[PDB]
Ligand binder design. Structure first.
Ligand SMILES: Nc1ncnc2c1ncn2[C@@H]1O[C@H](COP(=O)(O)OP(=O)(O)O)[C@@H](O)[C@H]1O
Ligand SMILES: Nc1ncnc2c1ncn2[C@@H]1O[C@H](COP(=O)(O)OP(=O)(O)O)[C@@H](O)[C@H]1O
Ligand SMILES: Nc1ncnc2c1ncn2[C@@H]1O[C@H](COP(=O)(O)OP(=O)(O)O)[C@@H](O)[C@H]1O
Ligand code: BEF
Ligand code: BEF
Ligand SMILES: [K+]
Ligand SMILES: [K+]
Ligand SMILES: [K+]
Ligand SMILES: [Mg+2]
Ligand SMILES: [Mg+2]
Ligand SMILES: [Mg+2]
Lengths: 524, 524, 524
């Protein structure tokens, strides 16, 4: 359709107005004393949230040029959420500061591309300084402190996440989902477990708990649809002679074979249970081979040149306990050599290194956890559903921040690390005067998060900013208790990855946004 | 539908208004100090661009006569993009200058057809002068300079493209795609490679890298669907006696034959890998014949009169190394006579000479690169997605400019070549006074790009243009560093093809736009 | 729906307003100094045309009585384009002049039917005078001059058309298509050629050019389906004994016969190529019989009572060379007696004389051209697409004018022939005074084209008209150089057919339009 075309300062003013609208909506939720935003939903009740990307993803304006400005600045928060899972409000605050100062410098007669180059140079130097300023985060106390800070100063969430990380291990998986009561609970599983249960209720040998218990059984791993029992007679006779229980993992067991097995169980001849293989497609084969490696067995498939009639005792894996119930199967203390397990997990790790999407990496890491580490689930408890959603979001944020701190270390929080970096970069110079102006723009915009944090508390940002800048090291301002001190001692920690990512994406979007001269959109 | 008819000066005023709207939208992005344009997208985020055709393709006007003018001038940029891939803003600037001066002459009582004829004569003479003025671009330093200038003065892109062109050769192919990191990378693959992987995971003999590696194999090229093992026993027996691996490139293999092959693999009988033939249809046959000529083998086809059971060791190709992964297959150092490869590439070159669509030519050039040269891929790295899109567009422009400069030579940049040509054409004359006026119109319009480049810098175009006109040779004006000097020494190079194409298309459209007397369009 | 009814002078002024609008849109493009008209297209870009019928076909008006007038006067241009292919602006100018003068006469109280009868009488006498005034046009110089004049004074177009007409001969056909370069080229084909290529790439015996070449082949013409080699075997063995190649033109060939033929090809047994028959249906039989009578063979069909298995060397045609490629087949120097060719072309001529649509006549003419003369194609080259379209239209107009001038002769151009005729018809009288008034109306309207040509030049039409009327013979006015002289020596020629058609159609529509008294249309 027809277009509307604007040039120069008019387009820049519309774009800045849209950016300011989105940023002012988002920045009320920053810090320990930030407040909540209510977001209307078409299908359901409103959501009360304190998360920056959640607020940013629903801001849209009726003016089309202002909406273009807002849509451009929204990508900073979206990309920060995708990268680190935290630090999105800080990214938006930095982007708005850079855009405002850059437009003010452009209107003074500077070349926008030289300003962009200066911003790029300052940001590269700042990221180098941040990496040199980081400190490792290894003890459980520091992980608890990071999880507490990220969950809006909540001691219990940090303590729970620290305990979960301690029990599960370095190669495990922790997940968050909705609970039932009013308290948080942590359920950890050791060993391997998949969401497939027994195929016949008569298999139950312990009616008290409604579960199948087997002691030191054999595991028959068959990559084949089992329908006729005639294929199953040799191994059945073998295990009957041996006298130990048998577990059959296959794609399915049909009516007559299942009937034969169940009839044989309750007569005291053989102790048999049968469950279906987990997953759909090639992943089924992968986890079948994982179980085979764990229990020291062999997968009986027709694509390798084996038939189940020829299966013998050494082809059956062995475990210590198998617990099957209506929904889950658990294999406990599988008998398998450590070398094979390490080789398999190494193969999965190098497979992880060559994965693109999040879904594949999550599945592969879950497989590594099943083979080697553990899997935990955190249940969030709240009285109402809105409180449940808000607490679940906070817990997920704390989980992400603790992970990032584990990979890349921690720096002093509260906006002090960026101030220290900007004070260190005071002698950085570029090629020409416009690049110097851009460097100064970036360095001055690095002080925005602390000023906004102090502003949300109702105090005077300039006095606090000058007092913090007058110090050195980890000297900072505690916004919760309104006192100065050492932020490392007070337990106010931020991951280096979150800070660095926020700075990088903010600069990347803002530098491009500064250079606009013309702006084209549809007519009202 | 009912129409609106407008005559003479009113029609010309509306047309010039539309042309001016589109040209002023496009011309803010010209030079080293041009800026960006934000284009609103219905599906997604806004697009920030500096490319002329991208801006031109979006402009539309609500008035209908003005929209006719804009739609008519848009074809200059479209044609320049399709022909050379670069120089669209310069073409638009030249078109607008010619249209403005020509309408000014027509309003003074000149015959538009004679003005058109004079403009065409001047443009023909100018193209001859430009061809007489160019210089070869053969060493890598000049290629780097051209790629740097065409990428908004980005040295790294120019050096990367120079290295890629050095490695991949004269007959190679270079493509640009999205990366994942923050740094650009170049990955060149030598030899022939196709994107078809192994047909069964059990074929892998190197689990550490997950690759199927074979040393000096036989290659069996079956242009048919392989159904039963029985058709293959003679070949397998011969290869097993021979004692070296065998690679089966066929249309596909089902469960039975593949099961037999895989069973034989790990038993130590014969080392065999199977992959699917690349392509779909006739191109599949062409690729199979290319592999046959490269490796020195024969394709087993029913339409030629041979069967798989009759195949011998003479119909099998040979190589030195074959590496297969989950997605790619690589044939390294095929053992074949160079004469056959030269004949095949000459035949494909002849096929190229009679190729119309660009897709077919691209596929044929990729096939020639596989046979004779290499394939290089440049992966662009950026922090966000808008930055990625801009960097990718600039890298593509630099690639096109370097190709054009290699094929046709380079002239002085900055709009200096056009000014030198116009100064050389100072005594050209036509048959009557209107033709002379048209010649002068074209000569005056040839100075527009330099004036616009100086205008975007905040300088005065008149003084700079006069000073440049006062010099001779490669003397010019550097807009980045704001000084005068030799354009060749300071590295501002422009392909002759881009300049010539821009001038030709601009004149071709502007001359016809000048001769309009009536306009017919729908009612509002 | 409800109707609106207007009576008398109101209806007549509405009609004249519509006529004036369309004619003023059209007449700006008349003469050597007429201009271009931009026509808006809903799907694509606007077209810049100088063709009168093209301008007329897109005129429609919001008012409904004015739209009736425009829709009525549009038929003159449509009919003139359909008949002669040229001279539509002149027809519209004549129609408007007649309508204006006739309405002026009617307003003075004269019977419209008598005016119509007088106009018809005058036009009949004028057409007789035009037929008597013509001179033959057979020289290549005169054909070049006609093509130059009709192509808007383009020497190259006239020269190219003259050369093409000389090469193809009297009975040949010439077509115009889009070229690829910037220069026009002429591509003439000698012999017979049809657009069917080889059925298998392995028939190629010259792979440097990728074409099949046979020297002194045998041509097997079979109007049947061939799938099994059993009915093909005896003639194949006979050809193998003969020792010379064979070309099979049939309906098509299935896999069995094609595989057999190709298998015998590269073994050196028989040099065989197979193609499909041209055409679909009865026309396919017609071209099969044409090839048979050209090469001196017999068509094998079931509907005549012959079988392929019974074929001998007598039923096989013979040629001197056959070249086949991906798309075209050419038979060079067929061995046939010219009496058969003459009889066949005579049969097709009598078929031509009894053809209603132009499409069947075009196919029959192409068949005669393939039998006797040649087929040429002119490729029009231009830089852009708008220039391409306008140049192609001009070339087609020049081709139409050249054919018409060959058919019926030439007269002096610039509107001088009509003036001479009108001067010769000064003594013509009717039955009553109103018929005499109608005759004078027609004679006055015959002077409109020269007046409009002079008006488009910026000169004063009345003085030029009187000076031309004062002369005699071919004395006229040259609007290109603004000079008087002999129109024949200056090279300004028009076909007699075009002038006669324009006059006839203009008078035919205008006479009816004069006699209106009431108009009935829908409500606005
Ligand atoms: N008690 C505190 N004193 C000072 N600063 C704090 C305190 N708690 C948190 N902060 C700072 O406030 C910021 C929290 O902002 P938040 O609302 O979580 O937005 P984001 O989505 O960017 O994390 C952190 O960067 C942290 O440095
Ligand atoms: N440093 C420089 N000094 C002077 N002129 C330059 C410099 N760099 C590029 N140019 C000129 O600017 C033009 C580049 O225009 P650009 O914005 O790339 O549009 P396009 O490539 O579409 O024509 C070229 O004609 C080139 O001669
Ligand atoms: N050099 C010339 N001097 C005078 N008359 C000319 C000249 N060239 C062409 N003409 C006249 O102009 C007319 C061409 O008008 P044109 O635009 O072709 O309209 P049409 O569609 O009726 O052919 C011809 O009738 C021809 O007699
Ligand atoms: F404006 Be061009 F695409 F460099
Ligand atoms: F306008 Be006509 F077709 F010469
Ligand atoms: K927040
Ligand atoms: K540009
Ligand atoms: K015309
Ligand atoms: Mg956080
Ligand atoms: Mg460019
Ligand atoms: Mg004409």
């Amino acid at each position: 359709a027809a277009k509307d075309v604007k040039f120069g300062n008019d387009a820049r003013v519309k774009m800045l107005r849209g950016v300011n609208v989105l940023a002012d909506a988002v920045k009320v939720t920053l810090g320990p004393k930030g407040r909540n935003v209510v977001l209307d939903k078409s299908f359901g009740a409103p959501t009360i949230t304190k998360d920056g990307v959640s607020v940013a993803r629903e801001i849209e304006l009726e003016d089309k040029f202002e909406n273009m400005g807002a849509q451009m600045v929204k990508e900073v928060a979206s990309k920060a959420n995708d990268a680190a899972g935290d630090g999105t409000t800080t990214a938006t605050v930095l982007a708005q500061a850079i855009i405002t100062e850059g437009l003010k410098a452009v209107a003074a007669g500077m070349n926008p591309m030289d300003l962009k180059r200066g911003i790029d140079k300052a940001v590269t130097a700042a990221v180098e300084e941040l990496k040199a300023l980081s400190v490792p985060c290894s003890d459980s106390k520091a992980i608890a402190q990071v999880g507490t800070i990220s969950a809006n100063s909540d001691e219990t969430v940090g303590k729970l996440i620290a305990e979960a990380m301690d029990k599960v291990g370095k190669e495990g998986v922790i997940t968050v989902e909705d609970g039932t009561g009013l308290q948080d609970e942590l359920d950890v599983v050791e060993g391997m477990q998949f969401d497939r249960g027994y195929l016949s209720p008569y298999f139950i040998n312990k009616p008290e708990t409604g579960a199948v218990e087997l002691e030191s059984p054999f595991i028959l791993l068959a990559d084949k649809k089992i329908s006729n029992i005639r294929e199953m007679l040799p191994v059945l006779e073998a295990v009957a002679k041996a006298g130990k229980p048998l577990l059959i993992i296959a794609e399915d067991v049909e009516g007559e074979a299942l009937a034969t097995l169940v009839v044989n169980t309750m007569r005291g001849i053989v102790k048999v249970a049968a469950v279906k293989a987990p997953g759909f497609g090639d992943r089924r084969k992968a986890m079948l081979q994982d179980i085979a490696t764990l229990t020291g067995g062999t997968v009986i498939s027709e694509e390798i040149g084996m038939e189940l009639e020829k299966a013998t005792l050494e082809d059956l894996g062995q475990a210590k306990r198998v617990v099957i119930n209506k929904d889950t199967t658990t294999i406990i203390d599988g008998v398998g050599e450590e070398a094979a397990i390490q080789g398999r997990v190494a193969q999965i790790r190098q497979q992880i290194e060559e994965a693109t999407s999040d879904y594949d990496r999550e599945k592969l890491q879950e497989r590594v956890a099943k083979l080697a580490g553990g899997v935990a689930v955190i249940k969030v408890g709240a009285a109402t559903e809105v409180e449940m959603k808000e607490k679940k979001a906070r817990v997920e944020d704390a989980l992400h921040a603790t992970r990032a701190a584990v990979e890349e270390g921690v720096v002093a929080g509260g906006g002090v690390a960026l101030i220290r970096v900007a004070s260190k970069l005071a002698d950085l110079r570029g090629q020409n005067e416009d690049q110097n102006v851009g460097i100064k723009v970036a360095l001055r915009a690095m002080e925005a998060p602390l000023r906004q944090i102090v502003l949300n508390c109702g105090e005077e940002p300039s006095v606090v900013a000058n007092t913090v800048k007058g110090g050195d090291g980890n000297y900072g301002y505690n916004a919760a208790t309104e006192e100065y001190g050492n932020m490392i001692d007070m337990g106010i920690l931020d991951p280096t990855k979150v800070t660095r990512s926020a700075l990088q994406y903010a600069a990347s979007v803002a530098g491009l946004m500064i250079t606009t001269e013309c702006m084209v959109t549809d007519l009202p």
